[PDB]
Swiss-Prot record, chain B:
The name this protein goes by in its record: Nucleoside diphosphate kinase
Recorded name of the encoding gene: ndk
PANTHER family in alphabetical order: NUCLEOSIDE DIPHOSPHATE KINASE, NUCLEOSIDE DIPHOSPHATE KINASE DDB_G0292928-RELATED
NCBIfam families the record matches: PRK00668.1 (NF001908)
GO molecular function: ATP binding; metal ion binding; nucleoside diphosphate kinase activity
Record's GO cellular component terms: cytoplasm
UniProt keyword Ribosomal protein present: no
SUPFAM superfamilies, sorted: Nucleoside diphosphate kinase, NDK
Protein's job: Major role in the synthesis of nucleoside triphosphates other than ATP. The ATP gamma phosphate is transferred to the NDP beta phosphate via a ping-pong mechanism, using a phosphorylated active-site intermediate.
Pfam family, any one: NDK
Top EC class for this record: transferase
Cross-referenced PROSITE patterns: NDPK (PS00469), NDPK_LIKE (PS51374)
Length: 139, 137
């Protein structure tokens, strides 16, 4: 399915570094089209809603303050195996363990400031895309 | 230390060079202050280009600007208006200097990859055209 879609977030650390274009190019150079995209500032409540599953752990507060500490760029990436391809391009969550040439190897400072988010399954991609985008934004 | 309007046009969006173009801005003293990918309506493109509506190329121009989606951004930095113009390069891609967006990604005068505001006054106008107060609260 050449029309598989997944959610990408370029997080506030990478936005502040000014590497939005370099990160987007990793996607477009590797068979993924930017189907939708906007730069947005999340409120505390919005980051809390998006990450409600981590309401669980100690690191929730820190995750939220980070995710609202500046603007992010949210995108729908579309293409064959988009969900897994995005994850492959992002690299392991720990930048120290991320393979060479991955976004997190190249641009991430630490586990906590790890540059990018990507949906981790088709199910979650559907939920995360709906959270950010109305159908008319997908063009 | 100003703001200017950038549009990555439908030809360049279709080529999938959005990231390469944005990187030209970010690597050269411009920050992306605001940004969205949008599909312009015929109406919207007619309003944007309304100063040229008695010119003979109005029609094709409008048709091209709605032929696919575009990426509209506010670029912020010292001398942004001129800096964006220097990065875009000459209107005619055949005349655009090396390392410019139009030299690398534009096919012709008609399909020339990018728009940029041409003055501070037009920057303010163009920014207000695309980015109105819309944070509901």
């Amino acid at each position: 399915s050449a029309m598989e879609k997944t959610l990408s977030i370029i997080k506030p650390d990478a936005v502040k570094k000014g590497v939005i274009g370099k990160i987007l190019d990793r996607f477009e150079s590797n068979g993924l089209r930017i189907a939708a995209m906007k730069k947005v500032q999340l409120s505390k409540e919005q980051a809390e809603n998006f990450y409600a599953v981590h309401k669980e752990r100690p690191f929730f507060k820190d995750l939220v303050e980070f995710m609202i500490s500046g603007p992010v760029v949210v995108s729908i990436l579309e293409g064959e195996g988009a969900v897994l391809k995005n994850r492959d391009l992002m690299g392991a969550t720990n930048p120290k363990e991320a393979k060479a040439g991955t976004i997190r190897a190249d641009f991430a400072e630490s586990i906590d400031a790890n540059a990018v988010h990507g949906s981790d399954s088709l199910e979650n991609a559907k939920i995360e895309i709906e959270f950010f985008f109305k159908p008319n934004e997908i063009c």
